[PDB]
Design a protein around this ligand. Structure first.
Ligand code: FAD
Ligand code: FAD
Ligand code: NDP
Ligand code: NDP
Lengths: 320, 319
């Protein structure tokens, strides 16, 4: 009788990897067509790069490097502050999935059992086992334990069996992010490959072809709006969002810009936790339900990975 | 720009009526194919709420209007109690109301011709700078809406309150208990005068004889304790165990039933009473109601809905 894991982003797959290394059977659930969550699923329109400040996470990254799924990104980075573009060099080590951000989670998932396009709506337990109800009213189960690995607002629905936990998780605010991708046939005549942006609807842009192993055919750019701007335009249409963020991009760039080959927009309602936490993970070991996610920690890739590990560590102790 | 109401149980429709009586347009959503929520009749069997009492004078007044309209009747069953292996008559001084021809007729009459989207499960609720918006399970946007009233069981409301985390954390602490309900029907009526029974020391909490509301069919409700212990049992097993509990307590022949159904209510009733009335973030424009804001009875849900609408109407002058 397997462990159910709800959410196949970094946190859920990290918990999955830990449990499977320990010999246990898992079954994964995601409402999306594929895995990866805010890493994006197999242009990098979600998470852009990540850093490793935790030695344990650093170790996992070295393992991903040796498996061929992560590499270092050293873009020529700029800053846009008060109407001025300026180079902003550093020596920060930044990692990206290769050949896209989605590659890390895809490899973590591997051949594990998974039910995609499966939105869980309820999680409840009998005297022994857990059961999941999905949005098509179908039952899934039995399961011995349940790990919730969703953004906090989406986990609260799944924690009715533990209202004290639900109440804590429901307090966790997430900020939204609108993303836009733009692709040019003629590359933009700038050496900029990424930019931290102030005083603008944008706070970040990245030049996809500067990342290792990406396709060079088009010069594609990813634009991330601030949370404040995203909130203010949360119900804007994709085409208005494209137009505004494209305009912001045209206003800070130092060079000419032809018409894009295509343009995309994507809204994340629950993109980033509003603040940081130190919980690591939240568990009701008595009932067998565990909660993890980036929002249990720093709200970065590293946080999500560490949270999934902590959830699985606690489950493993109690199994035994 | 209309007010969105998410849930077409009696709390949501009560809010709807109060808002529409005040001249304000609403739009109703429900994930089910029809309205009534836990006051729903299955096609006729009351599988959720069985009867209701009116103790609040305001709610009584509404019941009497419904009664004049033909949608409720006073139910006068021969009531029994089963205590310690003994079944005894248990008449009392409480007036009990039911919908007529079914418990659903009340909510159906309240909804009337109001705008409604059925089979529409809302999964996120968020606002831009101006208006509120709803996402459904098909990823379809609904809106713009001027305000939003959440009218669902508390565990189902938390996912819709992400725009108001403080409210969300309050709503999320509200425990709801499950009930397994079973309906059975017999070819020849059971040779007992009993028409209702309060049950102790049994998997069963309650049972009612349908034909005694204004084939001999019966509804059985299990205790929340037994329901939790068997929350993942199959329908056939539930039918079997609860039919058995009924055959054990009754004191006449009970031939095999000729029809049987089981229905699980995960969120049947709040585990405790509350005194909130409604919950709200009126500055943001989101309001929350349900039976679990008050007593966990039909009356509490109705009152909660009135209270949510009253709060919203009163706050308009500050907007
Ligand atoms: C625009 C954007 C840019 C970012 N940039 C960076 C960056 O530059 N650096 C960085 O370190 N981090 C960044 N992040 C954050 C990083 O992506 C996240 O911290 C990390 O990917 C979160 O992983 P997770 O497993 O906690 O959650 P998620 O990746 O959200 O995974 C949750 C999964 O659960 C699924 N799910 C949700 N509800 C249900 C349900 N009811 N039933 C079934 N499945 C469900 C979702 O579909 C999803 O797959 C960014 C995020 C966004 C949105
Ligand atoms: C077995 C049982 C027996 C009961 N017996 C009695 C009794 O004898 N006396 C008594 O007074 N009370 C009884 N009750 C309680 C009474 O039924 C409730 O107090 C009252 O009906 C609750 O009304 P409500 O509008 O708050 O919620 P509900 O009736 O639950 O309505 C909520 C509605 O919201 C909808 N909804 C939920 N989530 C979403 C979503 N995400 N998107 C869209 N729509 C959604 C649901 O489909 C439902 O229609 C009983 C309940 C049960 C289950
Ligand atoms: C989200 C991931 O954050 P993390 O994992 O911490 O990785 P980073 O350390 O690269 O991102 C942390 C923050 O530090 C600032 N920053 C980092 N490098 C530079 C630079 N060269 N020039 C200007 N600002 C910089 C940005 O904040 P800001 O954009 O607030 O300066 C950035 O959002
Ligand atoms: C949901 C209904 O709640 P409400 O609106 O309060 O309607 P009721 O007042 O009928 O139900 C309230 C509780 O009072 C007890 N009760 C009431 N009348 C009798 C009786 N005649 N014989 C035995 N027990 C009785 C039952 O509790 P118990 O079964 O605990 O006696 C019942 O669950």
């Amino acid at each position: 009788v397997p462990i159910a894991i709800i959410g196949t982003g970094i946190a859920g797959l990290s918990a999955a990897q830990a449990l499977t290394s320990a010999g246990h059977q898992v079954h994964l659930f995601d409402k999306s067509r594929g895995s990866g969550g805010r890493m994006s699923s197999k242009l990098d329109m979600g998470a852009q790069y990540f850093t490793a400040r935790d030695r344990r996470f650093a170790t996992a990254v070295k393992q991903w490097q040796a498996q061929g799924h992560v590499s270092e990104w050293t873009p020529l980075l700029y800053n846009f502050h008060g109407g001025r573009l300026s180079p902003s060099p550093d020596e920060q080590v930044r990692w990206v999935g290769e050949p896209g951000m989605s590659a890390i989670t895809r490899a973590m998932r591997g051949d594990l059992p998974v039910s995609f396009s499966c939105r869980i709506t309820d999680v409840f337990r009998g005297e022994q086992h857990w059961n999941l109800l999905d949005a098509e009213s179908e039952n899934h189960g039995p399961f011995s334990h349940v790990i919730i690995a969703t953004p906090a607002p989406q986990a609260t629905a799944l924690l009715a069996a533990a209202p004290k936990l639900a109440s804590v998780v429901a307090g966790v605010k997430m900020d939204p992010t609108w993303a836009v991708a733009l692709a040019f046939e003629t590359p933009l005549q700038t050496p900029m490959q990424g930019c931290f942006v102030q005083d603008s609807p944008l706070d970040w842009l990245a030049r996809n072809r500067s990342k290792p192993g990406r396709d060079d055919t088009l010069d594609s750019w990813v634009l991330h709006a601030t949370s404040q701007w995203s909130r203010q335009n949360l119900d804007a249409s994709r085409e208005q969002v494209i137009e505004h963020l494209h305009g912001a991009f045209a206003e800070l760039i130092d060079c000419a810009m032809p018409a894009p080959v295509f343009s995309l927009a994507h809204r994340w309602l629950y993109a980033r936790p509003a603040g940081s936490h130190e919980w690591g993970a939240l568990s009701d070991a008595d009932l067998g339900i565990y909660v993890c996610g980036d929002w249990c920690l720093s709200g970065r890739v590293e946080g999500a990975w560490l949270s999934g590990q902590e959830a699985a560590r606690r489950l493993l102790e109690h199994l035994q």
